[PDB]
Write a protein that binds this ligand. Structure first.
Ligand SMILES: N[C@H]1CCN(S(=O)(=O)c2ccccc2)C1
Length: 165
């Protein structure tokens, strides 16, 4: 069974107006099989709108494409983003109770991306742990991967994870 197509599609912004379906495909096929690849154009002029979409056969291929950033396509560095995830670098992690420590969160989340800050929330008056935390990554794709997952188990706790603004 295939991963849902909606989780295999990347929005590609910042395109050169000279990029075509064919040149976009030729570039992004280097990181996987593309089941679809389109440059968005004006309906009347056919002039590029400066963005497009590529759909890979597997989520692993999406990951490979994102890990190969920065992508310079037809002379311009473009901006890939997962098209469906339901742009920030920070998550709320709730439900971690009082026994979850920084190393629990780091050991778990470091496989989603490079962590820059872990903030375990404590009570302003007592210093007791409040049972939630914030994790900041160096890049948004980590967060997009994280919030797409249905489940997050950290330190034996079933955690609620959301984007933090
Ligand atoms: N309930 C089904 C309906 C669609 N999917 S999905 O494509 O796996 C998905 C997962 C996470 C975020 C956005 C989409 C699950």
């Amino acid at each position: 069974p295939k991963e849902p197509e909606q989780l295999r599609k990347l929005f590609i912004g910042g395109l050169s107006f000279e990029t075509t379906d064919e040149s976009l495909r030729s570039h992004f096929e280097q990181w996987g099989t593309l089941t679809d690849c389109v440059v968005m154009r004006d309906p009347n002029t056919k002039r590029s709108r400066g963005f497009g979409f590529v759909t890979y056969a597997t989520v692993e291929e999406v990951d490979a494409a994102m890990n190969a950033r920065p992508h310079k396509v037809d002379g311009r560095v473009v901006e890939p983003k997962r098209a469906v995830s339901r742009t920030v670098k920070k998550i709320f992690v709730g439900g971690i109770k009082e026994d979850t420590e920084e190393h629990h969160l780091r050991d778990y989340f470091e496989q989603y991306g490079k962590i820059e800050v872990i903030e375990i929330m404590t009570d302003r008056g007592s210093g007791k742990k409040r049972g939630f935390a914030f994790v900041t990554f160096d890049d948004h794709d980590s967060v997009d991967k994280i919030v797409i997952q249905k489940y997050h188990t950290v330190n034996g706790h079933n955690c609620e994870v959301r984007k933090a603004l």
